[PDB]
Amino acid sequence: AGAGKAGEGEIPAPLAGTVSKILVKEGDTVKAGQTVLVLEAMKMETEINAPTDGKVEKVLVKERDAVQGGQGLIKIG
């Protein structure tokens, strides 16, 4: 009953765009505010900042991949 969303572990996307480049990978740690991945929608590059401090345990989003607003982008832990 859901096309794609996040909240628990997975960070929700700001809008349904396209993955341009990945900044964080499984093994590197991130901080609440630091960019984790770049998005591309409406011909406008949008930076994705982590919601809280943690580490990337698994990246569901990949380069040249389509995402959805709210859909889990990356898992933090």
- Compute the distance between CA of residue 38 and CA of residue 45 in angstroms, rounded to an integer: 7
- Compute the distance between CA of residue 56 and CA of residue 73 in angstroms, rounded to an integer: 11
Which domain range does residue 4 map to? 1-77
- How big, in percent rounded to 5, are the helix, strand and coil portions of the chain? 0, 50, 50
Residue 30 sits in a domain whose CATH number is 2.40.50.100
Q: Please give the method by which this entry was determined.
A: NMR
**Around 67, how many Cα atoms within 13 Å sit in the side-chain half-sphere?**
32
Task: Please name which of 23, 61, 9 lies closest in space to residue 69, comparing C-alpha atoms.
Answer: 61
Number of domains in the chain: 1
- Compute the distance between CA of residue 63 and CA of residue 53 in angstroms, rounded to an integer: 23
Q: Which amino acid would we find at residue 58?
A: K
